[PDB]
Amino acid sequence: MNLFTPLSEINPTTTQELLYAYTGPAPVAYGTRTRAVLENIIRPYQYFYKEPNVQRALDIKTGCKEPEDINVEGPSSGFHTASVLKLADNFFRKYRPAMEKLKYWILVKLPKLKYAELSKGRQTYSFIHKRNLPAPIALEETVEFLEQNLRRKIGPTLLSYCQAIADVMELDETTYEYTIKFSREELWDQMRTLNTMWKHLERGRLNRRTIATPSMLIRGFVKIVEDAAKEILENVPTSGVPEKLAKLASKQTFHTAVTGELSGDQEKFNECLDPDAMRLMWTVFLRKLGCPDWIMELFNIPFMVFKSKLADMGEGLVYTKGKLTDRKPLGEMPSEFDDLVRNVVGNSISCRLGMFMGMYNLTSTLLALISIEREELTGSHVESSDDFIHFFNCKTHEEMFKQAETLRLTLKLVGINMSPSKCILISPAGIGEFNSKFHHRDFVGNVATELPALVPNGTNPMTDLAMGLNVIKHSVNTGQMNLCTGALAMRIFNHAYKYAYMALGVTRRTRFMEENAITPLLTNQGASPVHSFSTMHLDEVALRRHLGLLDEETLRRILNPNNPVTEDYSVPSCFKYTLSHKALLNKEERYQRVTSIINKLFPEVLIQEASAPGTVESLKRRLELVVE
Amino acid sequence: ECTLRALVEEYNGACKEAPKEMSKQFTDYNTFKRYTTSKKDHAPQMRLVYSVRKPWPISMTPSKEIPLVFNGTKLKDTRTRANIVVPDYWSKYGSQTSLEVVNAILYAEDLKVQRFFSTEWGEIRYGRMLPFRKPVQACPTIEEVNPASIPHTLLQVFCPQYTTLDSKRKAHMGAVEKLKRVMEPICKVQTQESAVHIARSLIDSNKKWLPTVVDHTPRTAEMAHFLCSKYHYVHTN
Amino acid sequence: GEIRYGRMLPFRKPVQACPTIEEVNPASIPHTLLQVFCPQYTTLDSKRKAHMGAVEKLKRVMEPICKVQTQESAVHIARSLIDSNKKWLPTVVDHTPRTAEMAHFLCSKYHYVHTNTQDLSDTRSIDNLCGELVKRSL
Amino acid sequence: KSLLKSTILHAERCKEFVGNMLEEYQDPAETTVQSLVPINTWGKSAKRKLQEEITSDPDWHQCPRKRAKMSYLAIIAGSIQDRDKKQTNVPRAFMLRGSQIEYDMKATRGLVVDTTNRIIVGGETVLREGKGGPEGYV
Amino acid sequence: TRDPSGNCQFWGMVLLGPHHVKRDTDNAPLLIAEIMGEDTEEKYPKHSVFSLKVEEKQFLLSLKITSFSRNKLYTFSNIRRVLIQPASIYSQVVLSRAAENNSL
Amino acid sequence: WTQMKKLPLLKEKEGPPSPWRALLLGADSEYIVCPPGTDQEAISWIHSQSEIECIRESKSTPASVITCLTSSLQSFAEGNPVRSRIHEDIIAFGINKKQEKKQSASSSASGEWKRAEYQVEEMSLPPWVEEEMVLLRSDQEDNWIELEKNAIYTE
RNA sequence: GCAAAAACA
């Protein structure tokens, strides 16, 4: 470690990039997630009171708590209703243009988003197949269920989807097309159910974490509230989304004044938040901007449903008799999670207060920001999920201490509970860290969490080369890499790219090209690379013809549109090729026919969305017009 | 030309082979456009080594021009599968094509070549510079097209007759006619599914964060990865 | 595996009593043992008639054993390790356990226990060699 | 490796092999020789070199180095020649068909290496100058 | 490997067992043989060290039984990426002492 | 809020020195110089010009796996990179080890079920880490880094 | 045996 701290010609801040476990395997989560999920569920109940009384906390419902009860010496879950209301008021009064643009978003383009964008989401646990399905499949199955059990056709807008969910939730009995039936309580429990799974490829901590994904029924509400949160976050200077750190770095203060710099993280960030605080925040903003009531319900339903979450507890606790091991569900035998036995509902478990990762990473940031807005907090704050940086600009050291302490207390007011061990404050400003960026005087250093893959993506030679060079270019643009690093990385990528496509040594492709007198004219064939550090933003084929390394006859041969095989800035060619109890493989093929007839008839869908009212048989209207 | 009703045969087959699925709305295309039953793997690059080394890696469209066996080497599986050595075979003994379509296909990529080589750049100046990342236009465009009007411009150059008069007014005049002189060789349906990407690139004015020690024009922003850095600068000329 | 009860017609055949580390023809067993234990009292013909792979395996096996077993005990332990010693037993067709070590457990007149064991023997390769020789000789 | 071990270690087999290759007579190893050497145009030069080496040294079939040189020349001689190409001089070394293994006339590198102390064929010391038993014992 | 004279450098051999692998994180049996320079009991307690005699020279051969997942093997096949960070430090130092006086 | 003069002092775990746990050997890595040729030629040379005798035997890796290693060397020399299984391969790759352990545990099971309560043994800093660091510094005759250069167009 | 709060074998 003494070798990572230079004392001359270079400061430790720049060499802190060496304190990264690059090029090593990322930690991988093994076994059952039941213990981790149970711990995640039980943490918020252990921090509600200063004295740990878990059993009393399992029946609290609304997590509002009185002052002189928030744990100031440790984690504290819950929130103070009056504090939340006042802080939301203060945040609403400030940042008026952000509120006006939120009003624009919620009045004009809110009833405009297509509901098909839920297909580009994350893995979803289907409530009909009783397993995990891709998001487009889950969306299609859910809309078929809605059509069957509601009899009204779903409109293109996602407001129609939300109305359909709300209407179908009031039916006492529902049946899917097979021909399985759902009770209303069963469907409600499925909506409450949260599918938890291990979080993979997570570097930066010793202990593995679990993330939870919502059901497709509530995903529309989750997406609308998340989109509103993102829209209001893009237009506030205290958010963690844009150059904010560099902007605050380029700040000059008074000649003789105390300028603090607090950089820290959040401990138990998802184990100390209550959806009711988010409810209060959103209701305050909506009420003081002047939206109608149906907007109130539309924005409040997601947290209402999340207050009754039924996160799945994995596969069960691990019990060992001798050398044997067994997986046992909670409650079968005594353990350290006996207080949650009463809340076990089948394979799932009920927890009224608490949060999970991957659900609301923007509304939590909004809650933290509304906590920031106060009177005596005359400083600069940047918040992004569980990481933050704060700049103090006051006149006295004790004033800075009071500001930091009231910042901590106000964060605790809504239950943020920043980690004391992870928070570092520097009396003179100039050194700090936020996200993976590092601050030293007037320079901010961007250090990547992951190195570029430096390997072909794995689709086709031209696409893989284009994506690799673009990734290297993005890495060098963000300041993470420089001349030497960029050139070395592109040499490494060139070697890996040539190896992966049988262009190194003796192999089938090289022997085939040698025996038939086929001269390798491209990088994937085995030719010398044409791309340089400056020219890495140029296409290979376009660059080779200018230098005379690719004869026009060869271009005619390869760029033939009548070719057997046929952002990505690569021209199509012969090298643009695609590598070769479910009971669902047939319907993806018949959907292929539906997608096949389109993009052959309509140039329009290749430009914009399919905005054609009706159009069930109605496609014949276009074909007749083509003839006419 | 005698194949127009073959397009209709796709509809007739769809009604009889795929009942009550193609009957859904045309607006649902945005839902099942990406419909796949294959799981989205977390690392497609880990399977590239096997896939190239896999026998019959490429699934080509059936054709007769490519020999089944060439110089004692099996090439196709007789959609049919192809050997890994079919593309480089096409690079020497492949079919010919018109010269005009070669430029059109490679268009929107050549323009970045001479525009770089024509630039003289300048002497390298090393200093304690502080690049700040500002959002600027990535690549120069032939015409300055307003955001949210780019798709309207693309509609005219591909489907001018199948458009709404409302979209006509909100279209960049002075740039629609410039695209037809370069998209004409590739305007045919044979290579029209991908020609939208090339046509879009001409007037795409997307904004990305680039290192800027001085106000960067699009002429100097596309190659900003080497012009300036923490320690060096290039006077673009 | 799982017990499959059922009436069975026995097939009486000689089966190997216990598995051997290496199979050697009976004529070569004494020479193999002589090479393993007392190479100093052998001739080149005896060495040529010995199975050298079995000699190496047996020497490696009996390096620690000969320190705790007398001469004759070690000699006959090695012999048992390379002797077939087939014995007649009632077996079940297409269920031969290749060795009678487990017949009481895996077999009876009322049941068999399904097991998944491969040959793990070089007899297939010797068949391949002999087939090539016969095909080219014809 | 097997063909060269056959020719080097035995003088009579080398005699028969060279005689059959030189006079185009039927040989047991015609298929192996044809499959080892690529389609070339060195057959006439190889047969010539055979002629002068036999005439110059009638007593060649006693030095294993001479046997190696004669075996290389005969292997090239019995190769599959090409019709539509004029014959060229035999090279010092060639590459085996469909492989990157080099066979060298001087046996300084590749498949055959003949050092002063010993001869190595395919990584194995076939013959040792003083300590060996290629002819066996009685 | 090959030194720049054609000679072959034998670092060792890795043997891969049946490895009926299903999941991308599943282990695969390996038997790794390596040419060791100096044996140490407390540093290699799970290794078996064998004497190796080639051309009257002395070498130590180490054999270990390991199982190693596909993800980790793929990651270590790209071990050449470890050169970037020291290259980053070297480049930053060199360019700082080029920005000081406009002299590379 | 408090202030610190002392930089934090990290506690050093005590116990047995941690052994070398890595896929390959690292510093103690050498090679045998073989005559020029292909991989098969080098493997054949090594298999035909060497004899193996065990010096140190570990209970974790039984010495019988040298038979598997030599069989693989011979098969690779004979142009067969993949070979059929042998008996010594049983305890070389953990074949049927899961079933063995499960059945043994079932046969010897006793007592009552309890929580898994896993534990990781603490180990001290080995003395060879400094030796590893100073040995990897040693100069070499060859470059050992052959990366193909990119093009050059600008200064 | 690999690996760490249990998965592979």
Span between termini of chain B: 54 Å
Q: Ends of chain E: how far apart? A: 36 Å
Rg of chain B, nearest Å: 24 Å
Shape of chain E: extended
Helical proportion of chain E, percent range: 10-25%
Largest interface: A-B, 127 and 112 residues
* Beta content of chain B: 5-15%
Subunit structure (chain B): RNA polymerase is composed of three subunits: PA, PB1 and PB2.
Subcellular location (chain B): Virion; Host nucleus
Family (chain B): Belongs to the influenza viruses PB2 family.
Protein name (chain B): Polymerase basic protein 2
Account of the 3D structure:
- Helices cover 39% and strands 11% of the residues of chain A.
- Chain A is built from 21 helices and 18 strands.
- In chain A, strands 13-14-7-15 form a four-stranded antiparallel beta sheet. In chain A, strands 6-5-8 form a three-stranded mixed beta sheet.
- The longest helix of chain A is centred in the middle third of the chain and has 18 residues, at 216-233.
- Chain B has helices spanning 4-17, 29-32, 48-53, 86-93, 99-106, 111-117, 150-158, 165-169, 176-183, 195-203, 218-221, 224-227; strands at residues 124-126, 132-137, 207-212, 232-234.
- In chain B, strands 1-4 form a two-stranded antiparallel sheet.
- In chain B, α7 crosses α9 (176-183).
- Chain E has a four-stranded antiparallel beta sheet, with no helix packed on it.
- In chain E, a hairpin with a 2-residue loop joins β4 and β5.
- β4 (48-54) of chain E pairs antiparallel with β2 of chain F, so a sheet runs across the interface.
- The structure holds one RNA strand of 9 nucleotides.
- Chain A: It catalyses: RNA(n) + a ribonucleoside 5'-triphosphate = RNA(n+1) + diphosphate.
- Chain A: RNA polymerase is composed of three subunits: PA, PB1 and PB2.
- Chain A: Keywords: Nucleotide-binding, Nucleotidyltransferase, RNA-directed RNA polymerase, Transferase, Viral RNA replication.
- Chain A: InterPro entries: DNA/RNA_pol_sf (IPR043502), RNA-dir_pol_NSvirus (IPR007099), RNA_pol_PB1_influenza (IPR001407).
